[PDB]
Design an enzyme around this catalytic site. Structure first.
Site, PDB file in Angstrom:
ATOM      1  CG  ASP A   2      10.538  -7.989  -2.056  1.00 41.53           C
ATOM      2  OD1 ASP A   2      11.218  -8.393  -2.853  1.00 41.53           O
ATOM      3  OD2 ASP A   2       9.610  -7.174  -2.081  1.00 41.53           O
TER       4      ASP A   2
ATOM      5  CG  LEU B 269      15.536   5.825   9.447  1.00 39.53           C
ATOM      6  CD1 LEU B 269      14.553   4.746   9.763  1.00 39.53           C
ATOM      7  CD2 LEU B 269      16.833   5.120   9.283  1.00 39.53           C
TER       8      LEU B 269
ATOM      9  N   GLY C 123       0.741  -1.268  -0.024  1.00 41.91           N
ATOM     10  CA  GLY C 123       0.018  -0.013  -0.084  1.00 41.91           C
ATOM     11  C   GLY C 123       0.899   1.412  -0.108  1.00 41.91           C
TER      12      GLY C 123
END
Ligand SMILES: O=C(Cc1ccc(OC(F)(F)F)cc1)Nc1cc(C2CC2)n[nH]1
EC number: 2.7.11.22
Length: 287
Positions: free
Chosen positions: A119, A75, A16
């Site tokens: 991933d 970050l 998303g």
């Protein structure tokens, strides 16, 4: 969610949209991921406990009106943008070494708790002004499963056992991805930029040689292995990642072993002689 004020869109994630947001009660600036199933709630809630300095902190999980929001530490930059910004000069080797060392610490922690990332890619490696680098989206692949915006999910860092149809892959898939990222930081080019599953597999074979039963026992029985694959000879790493020194080439070769059982672990990689002179430099960041 009425407790957060959106500041700006960070981007479109795999699951998303990601927004930079402000928490109205604490004044906290966070990254808010909007995800659009009970087993997922339980798996995600377990990631709230998986805390380490090289893992982006999962601050809270919010489930409301069939929507799921993940609140993360913010970050200011990701490694993909930092590598693009450093394209003309390259990232200095002491900074590459510090980043690889920190990411291996992150991996060694998660793997010791039997949690895989699955991933890893420069887009989900986040950096700060102090010289730290952190792994983002740890554990979300197992918890949830093109993106929601129809963007193609990148194959460039996918381990060969996943491409060959292994259903029960191991922590070795993350070491492969990190080896690919290490090579890209050094050369300023993606190692295996495949644009389809077969193109990804054949790019790997063209560099590391077509795998056979000698280097990878059991490879020929794998679900998507085909005896009709072309047979390419292996290349020397001296040609693949110049001007990396012999310690870095040796470590890279161990992170890119075909057999996942032979591939170096994160814990053993931390003991490698490449890290004898590791330091923690501060990057040059313009925000
Ligand atoms: O992905 C970034 C870097 C970044 C920061 C600001 C960006 O630009 C913007 F300010 F949004 F306009 C664009 C990209 N950080 C980030 C993401 C996460 C959590 C979701 C994983 N925590 N922290």
């Amino acid at each position: 969610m009425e407790n957060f004020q959106k500041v700006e869109k960070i981007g479109e994630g795999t699951y998303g949209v990601v927004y930079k947001a402000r928490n109205k009660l604490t004044g906290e600036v966070v990254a808010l991921k909007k995800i659009r199933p009970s087993t997922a709630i339980r798996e995600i809630s377990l990631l709230k406990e998986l805390n380490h300095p090289n893992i982006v902190k999962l601050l809270d999980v919010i489930h409301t009106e069939n929507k799921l929001y993940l609140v993360f530490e913010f970050l200011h930059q990701d490694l993909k943008k930092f590598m693009d910004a450093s394209a003309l000069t390259g990232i200095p080797l002491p900074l590459i070494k510090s980043y690889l060392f920190q990411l291996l610490q992150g991996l060694a922690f998660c793997h010791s708790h039997r949690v895989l990332h699955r991933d890893l890619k420069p887009q989900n490696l986040l950096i700060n002004t102090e010289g730290a680098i952190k792994l983002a989206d740890f554990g979300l692949a197992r918890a949830f499963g093109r993106t929601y915006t129809h963007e193609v999910v990148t194959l460039w860092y996918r381990a060969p056992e996943i491409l060959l149809g292994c259903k029960y892959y191991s922590t070795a898939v993350d070491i492969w991805s990190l080896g690919c990222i290490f090579a890209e930081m050094v050369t300023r080019r993606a190692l295996f930029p495949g644009d389809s599953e077969i193109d990804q597999l054949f790019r790997i074979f063209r560099t590391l040689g077509t795998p056979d039963e000698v280097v990878w026992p059991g490879v020929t029985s794998m679900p998507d292995y085909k005896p009709s694959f072309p047979k390419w000879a292996r290349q020397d790493f001296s040609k693949v990642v110049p001007p990396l020194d012999e310690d870095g080439r040796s470590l890279l070769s161990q992170m890119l072993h075909y057999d996942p059982n032979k591939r170096i672990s994160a814990k053993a990689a931390l003991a490698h002689p490449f890290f004898q002179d590791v330091t923690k430099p501060v990057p040059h960041l313009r925000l």
